[PDB]
């Protein structure tokens, strides 16, 4: 079936727990093997390390810059950037996931987990999954945004990888 993968998060160096993720490869397979990958490292890079470094409370919390920590850079594992996939999953509510961007077609690596419905985001991300687990652990990362974006604390994902 559909990918499980985690996220294991700190702030300021302390454990908050593990974010459980589903992705939906029967509707985005090139999108969720992606994001499957880059949780694994296995091409070499991916997610360990790296920050969530635009985090907006009542919206979103997103990570994935793992090349610049700030939001310029990231990239994928076909090339720095690639198509996207389809719309056809929506910006429901609380815990979907799907990829940030910088205009059509210009997915990378960044994502975010959606803390509310962001229906407007319809048509112009790709959503490729949502939260199975540790909702809990998003809110506390959304409690350490702000209105910019700019993190209080420093929130990191110390471990990733693919469990199914």
């Given at each position: 079936g559909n990918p499980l993968v985690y996220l294991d998060v700190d702030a300021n160096g302390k454990?908050?727990?593990?974010?459980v993720l589903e992705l939906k490869a029967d509707?985005?397979?090139?999108?969720?093997?992606?994001?499957?990958?880059?949780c694994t490292g296995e091409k070499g890079f991916?997610?360990?390390g790296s920050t969530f470094h635009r985090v907006?409370?009542?919206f979103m919390c997103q990570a994935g810059d793992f090349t610049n920590h700030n939001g310029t850079g990231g990239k994928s594992i076909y090339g720095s950037r690639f198509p996207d996939e389809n719309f056809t999953l929506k910006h429901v509510g609380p815990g979907?996931?799907?990829?940030?961007?910088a205009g059509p077609n210009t997915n990378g690596s960044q994502?975010?987990?959606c803390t509310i419905k962001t229906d407007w985001l319809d048509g112009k991300h790709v959503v490729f999954g949502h939260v199975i687990e540790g909702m809990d652990v998003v809110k506390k990362i959304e409690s350490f945004g702000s209105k910019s974006g700019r993190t209080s604390k420093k929130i990191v994902i110390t471990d990733?990888?693919?469990?199914?």
């Amino acid at each position: 079936g559909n990918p499980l993968v985690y996220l294991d998060v700190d702030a300021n160096g302390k454990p908050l727990g593990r974010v459980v993720l589903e992705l939906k490869a029967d509707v985005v397979p090139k999108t969720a093997e992606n994001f499957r990958a880059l949780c694994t490292g296995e091409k070499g890079f991916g997610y360990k390390g790296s920050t969530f470094h635009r985090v907006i409370p009542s919206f979103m919390c997103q990570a994935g810059d793992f090349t610049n920590h700030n939001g310029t850079g990231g990239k994928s594992i076909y090339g720095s950037r690639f198509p996207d996939e389809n719309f056809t999953l929506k910006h429901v509510g609380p815990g979907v996931l799907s990829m940030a961007n910088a205009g059509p077609n210009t997915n990378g690596s960044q994502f975010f987990i959606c803390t509310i419905k962001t229906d407007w985001l319809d048509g112009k991300h790709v959503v490729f999954g949502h939260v199975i687990e540790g909702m809990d652990v998003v809110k506390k990362i959304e409690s350490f945004g702000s209105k910019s974006g700019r993190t209080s604390k420093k929130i990191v994902i110390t471990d990733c990888g693919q469990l199914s």
